[PDB]
Amino acid sequence: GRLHSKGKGISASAIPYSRNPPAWLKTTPEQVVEQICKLARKGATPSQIGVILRDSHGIAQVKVVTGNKILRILKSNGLAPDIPEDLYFLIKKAVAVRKHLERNRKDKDSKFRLILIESRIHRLARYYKTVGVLPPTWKYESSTASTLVA
């Protein structure tokens, strides 16, 4: 239940029924795919892609219009991030916290949150390793996290 901190929180995004039409929200799937490809080329994460689509174009879900999800489409056209988005954001967050610790050390709450983030990264990292995404042996410390940054 929201992992680390206590608190349930039922903040969830709903998905409607009939995974096919939203008809009056026109535009062919091919056009949507090409827009997604353009966004990927400009350098945006799948989640950011989805948000952009939500903002401007007549879309509901890519999985509805097109046969595939965004990440799956990116993988088919070989335009996917090095470290699968969420993992990349977590490592960026960990780097930021380490840099804050380096600037000022006594902040024990920041050190605790750093530890939490590292644990969450390890939790993600193990399961990514299992699903043959990331190459075996993946360190997530200041020796490699700093090199990764972006």
Binding site: I10, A14, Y17, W24, L25, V51, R54, D55, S56, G58
Partner: protein
């Protein structure tokens, strides 16, 4: 209470239930069409937009984001589908 038709709740009790707690869950958000009176352009905006949606050019606006529904701007029209 004690017996009720659970496969056929009333639409009025269904409508006051939270999103994820309706019989099959579904959204309660909608899409709008928006024009701004000097332009014949029809941008289609999501109800709970997080983007400061801009029309096809003309550095204007169409809505601002909030904690809930996007506040559509000023004088604008909206049909809702």
């Amino acid at each position: 209470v004690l017996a009720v038709d659970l496969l056929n709740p009333s639409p009025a009790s269904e409508a006051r239930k939270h999103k994820l707690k309706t019989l099959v869950p579904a959204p309660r958000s909608f899409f709008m069409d928006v024009k701004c009176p000097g332009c014949f352009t029809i941008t289609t905006v999501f109800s709970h937009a997080q983007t400061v949606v801009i029309c096809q050019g003309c550095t204007n606006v169409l809505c601002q984001p909030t904690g809930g529904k996007a506040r559509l701007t000023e004088g604008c029209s909206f049909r809702r589908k």
